[PDB]
């Protein structure tokens, strides 16, 4: 309990050189981008395919009958 | 690394690794045959030996013979470069059309959709099959089960559904043939090329085919159910798409299990089945599902051994469905096709709040007169029709019409029925029965309602006789 | 006819907040 | 006119149900066109913070494997095990 | 601190070491996986893995916990949905689990208890009149699949709104709902059903399903019990529903067979009785000196083709304090909820009703087991004396009464209302084909007019000649106003 | 000596002994428990090891845990100071009233009353329950058995039995609930304190309670009945007294035996009971008996697994009885409680030279007519009733009367029935039926015999139902 409270510090001498290193998600390589597009399709699914930045116009429909 | 076959029996083989040892589930690779012989670890026996289930014939193997770990599960092609291609249980292609060049891969095993991912979206899926629609409707993105004994018409019914459904359907469909007839595959293939759901010319194909039929080893039948599983899985998730999964026959999966459980060394359970019939199933089964992301409407044909609806296999499977259609030899033998038991097929959406209490009312009204007829069934058999009270003489006649008007000549067996293939829309389904029930037709002969479309073809028929 | 009578009785954020704000039976 | 009024309280009720539907349309559209970004930022803060906390791993596997002076801080903290326990 | 793995397969890990491990003590695995000791043998501990045993490999490391298996407890669980070990799975971040009870608790012996006197209402006319449950009772729901076995247990929790959204601290009933063996697609669709009707708030929902490991279904209904044991052992009222024990048993069988414990009937293991016996005893009616708190338990069993000889269904019936049978036959016949009166029993009888129900239906359970047999004898169209001409002339109407909608309980007061209509003979002259459009009116007519009478009977739970008198006209004031 | 646990599965613990190998049956002691754990020895696997059944759950034990050879078989608080007290499997009291205080103790594993000690005297114990007394009377100091499938009224019967027979009795009663419902023990304690056969104050308690319910292990249940009978075996052999021993449910004894049998090394036998179901029962029923020295009236209740009276458990039980009341689901289902099958129930003393020609001739006459009615039963109900003889519509008429007059509102069943209890003296039963049989009530309608006491109380309902 006295030789362990500072080994939990090897974890923000890096957490540091990361949440400050701007210039893009660090060292990514190709992988980083592709996947951030697949989950950009399916997350663009449950909702629709129209413009998400604009206010949707409105087509309306009459009441059916059984 | 490397290890050796030390025991072989049937599809169960025992490999010894001195260095290292493959996780349970690692596809191994036999080194020494002209044929990719994947093993699949399923047990660590200790003494640095593992026990594996083959994925093909094991004639030839020898005590000795080397095996290489693949470091992974059995992994197969997934993605859109599968549509139109027939692939086997390990991903290898078998339509003799080269390889399946594809970006990514998936493993056949995989944990199942967590509780948060479930979706309670219940919307009706009309089939244009009178019994199914009127009494136990299928649900979009639901699990569907077709129960039948040998020859009652599961395969025909799955086909009719594939036709009345996956022909005019913007979205991907996967068909897994698990341990059934190889000639049924050849048949599907051609039938879907002509109709053009598969296209050899393009990548306009809308269907993927996974096949491991009743000629392949237990292991293969054991697993292939999952290969085709994995495929559908992708189209749901990495595409948030509308997937149609057809399997025929999901039973052969549990059966094949049984064949191997013996030599894997488990102790036999009820009726000889594998100890692990409920979970072996349930893992596999619960992957077939509609999640928040994508959406799978599943239709599984389920064989019933010796017509025993209590046999663990069919028996357990019921738990897993949202709509069930049960086929009885009894009915089929009276030429009532499709052979649907009206009092044994059910859907978890026959509910007025979901189908509108005109539907729910004509349904349970048919379902009632039928089950009233069924009670008289005994006295009519011993004493005869005459001893039937007057009220009851009717309950029969009406019921018997309903019985007959649930028959519907499918657009497939245009060959056995000879008759022209009808497809009846929910409206005229619900209508026609309502009328029959309110006895507008007590003046028409029975036959008049046997094998027709809407209630017109009924009243219409009745004339051509007269 | 009456069953159709018993079902019915039961029933950039500032570019969206500023833009947010049958009788032939009196015959037959 | 009894058989003629179930239909006059059907139309006065079959429009009560369509005019309520169009009033929850805009909700299911509007609150959606932005509850979208509630997610296009959700996968973003997590995924990044995956590669972020994971990036930790490969820089610490580089810290011990390298730094021969991170083999001294080995025998160290560890000999402080035997002791305490007893 | 613990040792090796000898061999692994099928959720069964043999372990060479753990030499001081308690039997039934949970170990932990190399990969961080909680297991469990069950076979303490000379040269190894067979351990039932509580999850995917792919991660395990020969040689891994197994470490003791010291603890016999336990789970989260207390109000910090209500409204949630937890797996068989207490972990939350509805994606709402951990529960406030200060309270941590053991699963393996034995049941209350003889003294800690007292005769079951406390009415546990289901809001189902059928049940609350002819097979009434009471707090501390075990009443089994048994039947073929798709007969309505669940829409019983659901309609009952959904009934407990009324009491849990009020003042009277005795009439309150917190609900646990184990879900063994089912498919997530359903557990969910069901929570959604609870939530909608707004009942989810007072209701734990432990869920170990199809895909969950074997020992996890074995354990689930126990866990869900401990959680309900707290509510009783601390002076409150719990209703746990195991759905279903059939699927659980199957699971226990798997573990047992894989553990190489020689198989018995239908392959199950010897103690497959002990399994349901012990679990089901843990529901009791604690005596005042212990809290006054209760644990009513509705176990659920599923039969094949009706076969109640099946090993299991016969065991569980021998255990519970009675049962409701279901029967698809009655179902389609129109008798929804399909019950089979004559074959359903409540081994606590009226000792668990209000003296309001008792007065309208206390000898009508032995009447619809004789009007039954006395319409099955004179089925045919002949002649029968002055005594048995009437019994039939009544019953047909009476049954049209227990015919009940779904997801629409009734408060005991209203139940007494309609039951009165017939039982006292204020329907003895009406065509059955109407006895529903009738009730659906005469009960919204005497809620809009006399919240009066309901007030009394609801509270004192009885019908004084006072209350009775008012009725005696409110009724009459209706038959003559329709037909006559 | 001292021994060390070698292995543990479910309910069966093997143990190893340095020196003192305990003889089979010898109760062993588990050192280190927060509550006492005994291990009845069961076999010598050899190499100084013994397999054993636990008289409680083995949750917690550990390979090597300390076990001590208690030197001799389980021993219990046999003696007079057990009255009013709830004992258990191993003696330990559990009504919370601190040690049972006696200096006489007996092992629960005795031998059995040899041939020469057998008493041949049998005299009719009237119960006031019409059906039993008319058709199958129990005998003072004899083995009685209550057969029943689940829910048919087995347990309720035995209550109304302990209410009637055991109250107007000035001897000692020992009720032992083996393997059934804990709820039902608590339930009886308090009824038996309201009546005060158990009195918490004085020492006028006439009833020893031994208990081991469906919540306890197989070890317990397998032996709870061995205990409760050791208890009633004392009150017999000593006093020369009239001991009433009730068990509920002697079935749970063989079932319990079943559960461990597997783990004990037994190829299973038919229906999957122990290969020993037979003798296990024998060397244990053969103790619940009546010697010259004393008498024990015994009233066991037997579960019939799934109602199959041929299931090797209830089946083998029949040999060990002198009078058997068999309960019918089909009767109960008709509302005729107590659902006694007047054609499957039997007494040894239904002999005209024991009960008299009036009694006998009258019972057998009822038995006959009910049997004849059973015979017309699938003619009539499928081929027109009035197609019967004149003779037959008559033997139907009377039969259904007889058949209903056989029901009784039980005093412990008012909660269910709805009528105040009842109880008919033998000679008013004989008379009642003799009459109905004789054609004296062919005018009164059916329901008048349904659930009344003495025959006249039907002539009562005969007008009450009229006008
Ligand atoms: N829906 C149908 N309408 C008319 N005739 C049918 C129908 N279905 C089956 N038949 C007839 O009965 C046979 C069985 O069809 P099939 O769908 O193959 O049964 P099955 O469920 O597949 N049993 P099996 O394929 O052997 O495991 C046909 O080949 C027909 O001659
Ligand atoms: N009182 C009722 N009136 C009309 N329909 C009902 C009623 N109760 C239940 N149902 C319907 O009958 C079906 C079966 O109900 P359920 O509670 O799932 O029985 P079950 O035997 O538990 N089904 P399962 O879990 O597959 O065994 C449902 O989908 C309901 O909507
Ligand atoms: N004497 C009786 N009179 C009326 N009904 C009875 C009577 N005895 C039993 N019953 C009915 O039978 C049910 C079960 O009784 P029980 O004796 O506990 O069955 P078991 O035989 O398994 O112990 C009761 O709860 C009750 O409704
Ligand atoms: Mg087929
Ligand atoms: Mg259910
Ligand atoms: Mg009982």
CATH of the domain at B30: 2.40.10.170
> Cβ distance B371 to B357 under 8 Å?
no
CA-CA distances (angstroms) from residue C3 to B130, B159, B356, B435? 21, 35, 8, 15
Nearest Cα residue in chain B from E380: B389
Report the DSSP beta bridge partners of residue E237: E294
Q: Which of E102, E113, E261, E347 is flagged as catalytic?
A: E347
Per DSSP, helices labelled H in F386-464 are 390-405, 426-438, 456-464
Strands B143-148 and B323-326: parallel
The partner residue sitting opposite C20, judged by closest CB among D13, D15, D30, is: D30
∠ CA E12-E14-E16, nearest 5°, is: 165
Measured in degrees and rounded to the nearest 5, phi and psi for residue B394 equal: -70, -60
- Classify the phi-psi angles of B334: left when phi > 0, otherwise alpha if psi is within -120 to 50, otherwise beta: alpha
Whether residue A38 and residue B240 make contact (CB cut-off 8 A), yes or no, is no
CB atoms within 10 A of CB E291: 15
| Residue F215 and residue F182 in contact, taking contact as beta carbons nearer than 8 Å | yes
End-to-end CA distance of chain D: 97
Are both F113 and F224 inside the same structural domain? yes
Q: Do E179 and E356 meet the contact criterion of CB atoms below 8 Å apart?
A: no
Please answer yes or no on whether D6 and C8 come within 8 Å at the CB atom. no
Q: Which long-range contacts (CB under 8 A, 24 or more apart) does B89-93 make?
A: B89/B55, B89/B210, B89/B212, B89/B216, B89/B220, B89/B223, B89/B224, B89/B227, B90/B27, B90/B36, B90/B38, B90/B55, B90/B227, B91/B227, B92/B36
Element (H, E) at E237: strand E237-243
d(CA F467, CA F465): 6
SS3 state at E472: helix
**Closest among B106, B90, B88, B112 to B27, alpha carbons compared:** B90
C-beta atoms of D14 and C8 within 8 A? yes
CA distances (Å), B422 to each of B127, B460, B463, F196, in order? 11, 15, 19, 80
3-state secondary structure of E66: strand
Cα–ligand 4 centroid distance for B412 (angstroms): 14
**E181 CB under 6 A from ligand 2?**
no
CATH code assigned to E1-67: 2.40.30.20
Number of domain units in chain B? 3
Residues 6+ apart with CB under 8 A from E10: B43, B266, B275, B276, E53, E258
Buried-state track F190-220, b at ≥16 Cβ within 10 A, e below 16:
bebeeeebbbeeeeebbbbbbbbbbbbbbbb
Residue F254 · residue F224 · CB < 8 Å: no
3-state helix, strand, coil in chain F (%, to 5): 35, 20, 45
Q: Are residues F293 and F200 part of one domain?
A: yes
Using an 8 Å Cβ cutoff, are F137 and F126 in contact?
yes
Using the mean position of ligand 6's atoms as its centre, give its distance from the Cα of residue F215 in Å.
14
Which residues of E fall within a CB distance of 8 Å from F64?
Answer: 19-20
Record the tokens describing residue B234, joined without a space: 């992708």
* Gap from CA of A40 to ligand 6 centroid (Å): 64
Residue F221 annotated in active site: no
Q: How far apart are CA B10 and CA B58, in angstroms?
A: 7
Residues 39-58 of D with CB under 8 A from A: 39-40, 43, 47-48, 51-53, 55-56
State the closest ligand 2 atom to the C-alpha of E326, by its place in the atom list counted from 1.
Answer: 21
Cβ atoms within 10 Å, residue A46: 14
Considering only CA atoms, which residue is closest to atom 8 of ligand 3? Answer: F153
Is the Cβ of D6 closer than 8 Å to some Cβ of chain C? yes
Q: What is the CATH number of the domain that holds F111?
A: 3.40.50.300
Token output for F241 = 């007294």
Of the residues F32, F57, F73, which one is the last residue of a structural domain? Answer: F73
Domain identity same for B87 and B228: yes
Residue pointed to by tokens 């069924």:
B374
CA distance E426 to E412: 20
**Residue at token pair 């329907």:** E427
Block residue for tokens 């820089």? D59
Question: How close is the Cα of E151 to the center of ligand 1, in Å?
Answer: 36
Chain F partners within 8 Å of E264 (Cβ): 258, 262, 268, 272
Residue B171's alpha-carbon distances to B207, B243, B461, F70, F129, in angstroms, are 9, 6, 39, 76, 75
Enter the DSSP assignment of F350. Answer: -
- For B48, the token pair is 């640095």
Nearest protein Cα to ligand 2, atom 11: E148
Nearest to B350 by CA among B365, B328, B336: B365
Token pair listed for A66: 């059984």
Q: How far is CA F395 from CA F341, F381, F438, in A?
A: 19, 15, 11
SS3 state at F371: helix
CATH architecture of A1-48: Helix non-globular (6.10)
Give the method used.
Answer: X-ray
- Token pair recorded at residue F354: 């024991």
Q: Which of B78, B106, B240 to mutate to test the interface with A (most CBs of A within 10 A)?
A: B240
Residue B47: partners with Cβ closer than 8 Å, 6 or more residues away: B16
Candidates E149, E122, E131; CA nearest to E328 is E149
Last-in-domain residue among B73, B105, B120: B73
Please, what is the end-to-end C-alpha distance for chain B in angstroms?
A: 82
Report the phi/psi class of residue F25: left, alpha or beta, with left for phi > 0 and alpha for psi in -120 to 50: left
Q: Which of residues 204-263 of E touch B (CB under 8 A)?
A: 207, 209-211, 213-214, 247, 250-251, 253-254, 257-258, 260, 262-263
Whether residues B399 and B372 fall in one domain:
yes
Phi and psi at residue E156, to the nearest 5°: -85, -45
Q: In Å, how far are F249, F339, F348, F410 from F325, measured between CA atoms?
A: 15, 10, 12, 16
Q: Verify whether the Cβ–Cβ distance C16 to A53 is below 8 Å.
A: no
Task: Return the SS3 of E210.
Answer: coil
Beta-carbon contacts of E367 under 8 Å, excluding residues fewer than 6 positions away, are E391
> HSE of E66 in the Cβ direction (CA atoms, 13 Å)?
1
Burial class (CB in 10 A: 0-12, 13-18, 19+), F48: middle
Q: Find all residues with CB under 8 Å of F408, minimum gap 6, and list them.
A: F129, F130, F131, F337, F338, F422, F424, F451, F453
**CA nearest neighbour of E59 among E114, E100, E16:** E16
Phi, psi of E273, rounded to the nearest 5 degrees: -80, -50
d(CA D35, CA D53): 27
Residues 248 through 277 of chain B touching chain E, CB cutoff 8 Å: 266-270, 275-276
Angstrom distance (rounded) from CA F135 to CA F365: 10
Residues B6 and B79 in one domain: no
Rounded to the nearest 5°, which phi and psi values hold at E216? -75, -25
Tokens, residue B346: 């059910």
- Residue E405 corresponds to which tokens in the numbers above? 């909608």
User: What is the rounded CA–CA span in Å between residue F364 and residue F356?
Assistant: 12
Q: Could C25 and D4 be called an inter-chain contact, meaning their C-beta atoms sit closer than 8 Å?
A: yes
Place of tokens 């009652």: B152
Nearest to F7 by CA among F46, F75, F63: F63
Among the listed residues B301, B209, B216, B214, the one whose alpha carbon sits nearest the alpha carbon of residue B250 = B301
- Please provide the size of chain D in residues: 86
Distances (CA, A) of F155 to B452, E299, E478, F161: 60, 22, 46, 10
Other CB atoms within 10 Å distance of the CB of residue B388: 16
Q: Is the dihedral of CA F361, F365, F367, F371 positive or negative?
A: positive
3-state secondary structure chain B: CEEEEEEEECCEEEEEECCCCCCCCCEEEEECCCCCCEEEEEEEEECCEEEEECCCCCCCCCCEEEEEECCCCCEEECCHHHCCCEECCCCCECCCCCCCCCCCEEECCCCCCCHHHECCCCCEECCCCHHHHHHCCEECCCEEEEEECCCCCHHHHHHHHHHHHHCCCCCCEEEEEECCCHHHHHHHHHHHHHCCCCCCCCCCCCEEEEEECCCCCHHHHHHHHHHHHHHHHHHHHCCCCEEEEEEECCHHHHHHHHHHHHHHCCCCCHHHCCCCHHHHHHHHHHHCCCECCCEEEEEEEEECHHHCCCCHHHHHHHHHCCEEEEECHHHHCCCCCCCECCCCCEECCCCHHHHCCCHHHHHHHHHHHHHHHHHHCCHHHHCCHHHCCHHHHHHHHHHHHHHHHCCCCCCCCCCCCCCCCCCCCHHHHHHHHHHHHCCCCCCCCCHHHCCCCCHHHHHHHHHHHC
User: Is the distance from CB of B408 to CB of B419 less than 8 angstroms?
Assistant: no
Does A57 lie at the interface with C, CB-CB under 8 angstroms?
A: no
For domain E68-353, is the CATH number 1.10.10.1100? no
Distance of CA B365 to the CA centre of its chain: 29
Task: State which CATH number among 3.40.640.10, 2.60.120.560, 1.20.5.2210, 3.30.1330.10 fits the domain covering D1-86.
Answer: 1.20.5.2210
Q: CA-to-CA distance for F84 and F93, rounded, in angstroms? A: 11
Name residue E178's beta-bridge partners.
E242
Q: Compute chain D's Rg from CA coordinates.
A: 33
Angle among Cα A15, A17, A20 to the nearest 5 degrees reads 95
Asked whether residue E415 is marked as a ligand-binding residue, the answer is: no
Inter-residue contact E354 to E119 (CB < 8 Å): yes
Q: Which residues of F touch E21 (CB under 8 A)?
A: 62-63
Q: Is E3 helix (H, G, I), strand (E, B) or coil?
A: coil
Task: Please enumerate in sequence order all residues whose Cβ is within 8 A of that of F420, keeping only pairs 6 or more positions apart, or say none.
Answer: F409, F414
Residue E18 exposure: Cα atoms within 13 Å on the Cβ side:
37
- Selection from F273, F221, F228, F249 nearest residue F150 by Cα: F249
Within 8 A by CB and 6+ apart from B10, the residues are: B58, B217, B218, B259, B260, B263
Task: Count other Cβ atoms within 10 Å, centred on residue C1.
Answer: 10
**Cβ(F214) – ligand 3 distance below 6 Å:** no
| b/e per residue B206-223 (b: at least 16 CB within 10 A) | bbbbbbbbbebbbbbbbb
Query: Rounded to an integer, what distance in angstroms lies between the CA atom of residue F213 and that of residue F233?
Result: 21
Same domain, B401 and B442: yes
Phi, psi (degrees; rounded to nearest 5) at F451? 65, 60
F440 is in an annotated binding site: no
How far is it, in rounded angstroms, from Cα B90 to Cα E63?
38
Alpha carbon distance B200, B189 (integer Å): 11
Q: What is the CATH number of the domain that holds F443?
A: 1.10.1140.10
Q: Of B365, B412, B403, B343, which Cα lies nearest the Cα of B155?
A: B412
Cα-flanking dihedrals φ and ψ of residue B3, to 5°? -155, 180
Report DSSP letters for F89-146, one per residue: TTS---SS------S--EES------GGGB----EEE--S-HHHHHHS-EEET-EEEE
- Same domain (yes/no): F219, F271: yes
The DSSP code sequence of F14-26 is EEEESS--PPTT-
Residue pair B225/B178 in contact by the 8 Å Cβ criterion: yes
Locate B269 and state its tokens: 């359970």
Cβ-based neighbour number of residue E173 at 10 Å? 25
Instruction: Measure CB to CB from residue D43 to each of A26, A32, A43 and give the nearest one.
Output: A43
Quote the DSSP letter at residue F154. Answer: H
3-state SS class at A57? coil
CB E384 within 8 A of CB F385: no
How many Å apart are CA D40 and CA D32, to the nearest integer? 12
Distance CA F138, CA F145 (A): 10
Where would I find the beta strands (DSSP E) of E25-118? 25-29, 37-41, 44-48, 62-68, 70-72, 100-102
Is F178 a known ligand-binding residue? no
In which residue are the tokens 């493993």 written? B107
Chain C CB contacts of B361 under 8 Å are 3
Identify whether the C-beta of residue F104 lies closer than 8 Å to the C-beta of residue F313. Answer: no
Do residues F300 and F360 share a domain? no
Ligand 2 within 6 A of CB of E406: yes
Q: Rounded distance, CA F84 to CA F95, Å?
A: 9
* Beta strands F143-148 and F323-326, pairing class: parallel
CA B112 from chain centre, in angstroms, equals: 19
User: What is the spatial distance between Cα A62 and Cα B65, in angstroms, rounded to a whole number?
Assistant: 74
Homologous superfamily (CATH) of E354-484 is: ATP synthase alpha/beta chain, C-terminal domain (1.20.150.20)
Report the nearest atom of ligand 1 relative to the CA of B151: 23
**Distance (Å, whole) CA B177 – CA B200:** 20
Domain boundary among F73, F94, F115: F73
Helix axes E435-442, E390-402, angle to 10 degrees: 60
- Using an 8 Å CB-CB cutoff, list chain B residues near E328: 343
CB atoms inside a 10 Å sphere around CB A63: 13
Candidates E53, E129, E29; CA nearest to E346 is E129
Instruction: Enumerate long-range contacts of B371-376, CB under 8 Å, 24 or more apart.
Output: B371/B343, B371/E329, B371/E332, B371/E333, B372/B399, B372/E333, B373/B399, B373/B400, B373/B403, B374/B343, B375/E329, B375/E333
The string of DSSP codes covering D55-77 is HHHHHHHHHHHS-GGGSHHHHHH
Q: Is B39 in the pocket of ligand 1 (CB under 6 A)?
A: no
How far are the Cα atoms of B83, F214, F270 from residue F273, in angstroms, in the given order? Answer: 58, 19, 6
What's the rounded Cα separation, in Å, for the pair E8 and B73? 17
Residue E44's DSSP bridge partners are E41
- Domain of residue F198 covers 74-349
Which pair of tokens denotes residue B30?
Answer: 């036999």
Map tokens 């009910």 to a residue. Answer: F370
Taking CA–CA distances from A35, the nearest residue in chain B reads B238
């Amino acid at each position: 309990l006295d030789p362990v409270q500072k080994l939990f510090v090897d974890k923000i001498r890096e957490y540091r050189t990361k949440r400050q290193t701007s210039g893009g998600p660090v060292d990514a390589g190709p992988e980083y981008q592709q996947d951030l597009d697949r989950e950009l399709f399916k997350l663009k699914q449950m909702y629709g395919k129209a413009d998400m930045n604009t206010f949707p116009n409105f087509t309306f429909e009459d009441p059916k009958f059984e | 690394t490397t290890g050796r076959i030390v025991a072989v029996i049937g599809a169960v083989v025992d490999v010894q690794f001195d260095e290292g040892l493959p996780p349970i589930l690692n596809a191994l690779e036999v080194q020494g045959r002209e044929t990719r012989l994947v093993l699949e670890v399923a047990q660590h026996l200790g003494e640095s030996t593992v026990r594996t289930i083959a994925m093909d014939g094991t004639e030839g193997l020898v005590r000795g013979q080397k095996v290489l770990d693949s470091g992974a599960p059995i992994r197969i092609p997934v993605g859109p470069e599968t549509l139109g291609r027939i692939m086997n249980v390990i991903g290898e292609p078998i339509d003799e059309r080269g390889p399946i060049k594809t970006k990514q891969f998936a493993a056949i095993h995989a944990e199942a959709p967590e509780f948060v991912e479930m979706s309670v979206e219940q919307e009706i899926l009309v089939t244009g099959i009178k019994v199914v629609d009127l009494l136990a409707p299928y649900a979009k993105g639901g699990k569907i089960g077709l129960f039948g004994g040998a020859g009652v018409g599961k395969t025909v019914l799955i086909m009719e559904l594939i036709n009345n459904v996956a022909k005019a359907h913007g979205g991907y469909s996967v068909f897994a043939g698990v341990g059934e007839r190889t000639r049924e595959g050849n048949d599907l293939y051609h039938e879907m090329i002509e109709s053009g759901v598969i296209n050899l010319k393009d990548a306009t194909s809308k269907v993927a085919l996974v096949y491991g039929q009743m000629n392949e080893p237990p292991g293969a039948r054991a697993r292939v159910a999952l290969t085709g599983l994995t495929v559908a899985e992708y189209f749901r998730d990495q595409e948030g798409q509308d997937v149609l999964l057809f399997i025929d026959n999901i039973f052969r999966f549990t059966q094949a299990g049984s064949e191997v459980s013996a030599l894997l060394g488990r102790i036999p359970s009820a009726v000889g089945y594998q100890p692990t019939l409920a979970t072996d199933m349930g893992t596999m089964q619960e992957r077939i599902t509609t999640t928040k992301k994508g959406s799978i409407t599943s239709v599984q044909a389920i064989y019933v051994p010796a017509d025993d609806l209590t046999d663990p296999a069919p028996a357990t499977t019921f738990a897993h469905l949202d709509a069930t259609t049960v086929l009885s030899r009894a009915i089929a033998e009276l030429g009532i096709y499709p052979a649907v038991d009206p009092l044994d097929s059910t859907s978890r959406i026959m509910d007025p709040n979901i189908v509108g209490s005109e539907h729910y009312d004509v349904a349970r009204g048919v379902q009632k007169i039928l089950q009233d007829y069924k009670s008289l069934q005994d006295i009519i058999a011993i004493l005869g029709m005459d001893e039937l009270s007057e009220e009851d003489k009717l309950t029969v006649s009406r019921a018997r019409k309903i019985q007959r008007f649930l028959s519907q000549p499918f657009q497939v067996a245009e060959v056995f029925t000879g008759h022209l293939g009808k497809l009846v829309p929910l409206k005229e389904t619900i209508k026609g029965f309502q009328q029959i029930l309110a006895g507008e037709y007590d003046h028409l002969p029975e036959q008049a309602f046997y094998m027709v479309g809407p209630i017109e073809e009924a009243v219409a028929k009745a004339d051509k006789l007269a | 006819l009456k069953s159709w009578n018993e079902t019915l009785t039961s029933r950039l954020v500032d570019d969206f907040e500023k833009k947010f704000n049958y009788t032939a039976q009196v015959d037959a | 006119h009894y058989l003629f009024d179930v239909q006059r309280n059907n139309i006065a009720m079959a429009l009560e149900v369509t005019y309520r539907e169009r009033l929850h349309r805009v909700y299911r559209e509007v609150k959606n066109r932005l509850d979208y970004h509630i997610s296009v930022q959700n996968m973003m803060r997590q995924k990044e913070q995956e590669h972020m906390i994971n990036w930790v791993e490969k820089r610490v596997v580089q810290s011990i494997s390298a730094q021969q002076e991170k083999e001294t801080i080995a025998k160290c903290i560890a000999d402080l095990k035997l002791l305490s326990k007893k | 601190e613990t040792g090796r793995v000898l061999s692994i397969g099928d959720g069964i890990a043999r372990v060479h070491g753990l030499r001081n491990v308690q039997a039934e003590e949970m170990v932990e695995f190399s990969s961080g996986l909680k297991g469990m000791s069950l076979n303490l043998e000379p040269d190894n501990v067979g351990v039932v893995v509580f999850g995917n045993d792919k991660l395990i490999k020969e040689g891994d490391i197994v470490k003791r916990t010291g603890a016999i298996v336990d789970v989260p407890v207390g109000e910090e669980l209500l409204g949630r949905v937890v797996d068989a070990l207490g972990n939350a799975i509805d994606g709402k971040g951990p529960i406030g689990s200060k309270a941590r009870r053991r699963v393996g608790l034995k049941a209350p012996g003889i003294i800690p208890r007292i005769s079951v006197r406390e009415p546990m209402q289901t809001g189902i006319k059928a049940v609350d009149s002819l097979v009434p449950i009471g707090r501390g009772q075990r009443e089994l729901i048994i039947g073929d699949r798709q007969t309505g076995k669940t829409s019983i247990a659901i309609d009952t929790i959904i009934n407990q709104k009324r009491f849990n959204d009020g003042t009277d601290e005795k009439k309150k009933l917190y609900c646990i709902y184990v879900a063994i063996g089912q498919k997530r697609s359903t557990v969910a669709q069901l929570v959604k059903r609870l939530t909608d009707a707004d009942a989810m708030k007072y209701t734990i929902v432990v869920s170990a399903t199809a895909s969950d490991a074997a020992p996890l279904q074995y354990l689930a209904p126990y866990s869900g019990c401990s959680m309900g044991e707290y509510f009783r052992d601390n002076g409150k009222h719990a209703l746990i529903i195991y759905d279903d024990l059939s699927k659980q048993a199957v699971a226990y069988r798997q573990m047992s067979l894989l553990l190489r414990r020689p198989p018995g009937r239908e392959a199950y293991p010897g103690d497959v009785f002990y399994l349901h016996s012990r679990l089901l005893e843990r529901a009791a009616k604690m005596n005042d000196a212990f809290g006054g708190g209760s644990l009513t338990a509705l176990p659920v069993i599923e039969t094949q083709a009706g076969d109640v000889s099946a090993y299991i269904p016969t065991n569980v019936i021998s255990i519970t304090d009675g049962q409701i049978f279901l029967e698809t036959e009655l179902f389609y016949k129109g008798i929804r909820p399909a019950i089979n009166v004559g074959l359903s029993v409540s081994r606590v009888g009226s000792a668990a009703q209000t003296r309001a129900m008792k007065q309208v239906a206390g000898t009508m359970k032995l009447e619809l087991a004789q009007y039954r047999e006395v319409a099955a004898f004179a089925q045919f169209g002949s002649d029968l004396d002055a005594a048995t001409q009437q019994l039939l002339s009544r019953g047909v109407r009476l049954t049209e009464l227990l015919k009940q909608g779904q997801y629409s309980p009734m408060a005991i007061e209203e139940q007494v209302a309609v039951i009165y209509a017939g039982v006292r003979g204020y329907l003895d002259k009406l065509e059955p084909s109407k006895i529903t459009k009738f009730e659906n009116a005469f009960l919204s007519h005497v809620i809009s007019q006399h919240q009066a009478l309901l007030g009394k009977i609801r509270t004192d739970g009885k019908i004084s000649e006072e209350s009775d008198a008012k009725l005696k006209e409110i009724v009459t004031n209706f038959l003559a106003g329709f037909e006559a």
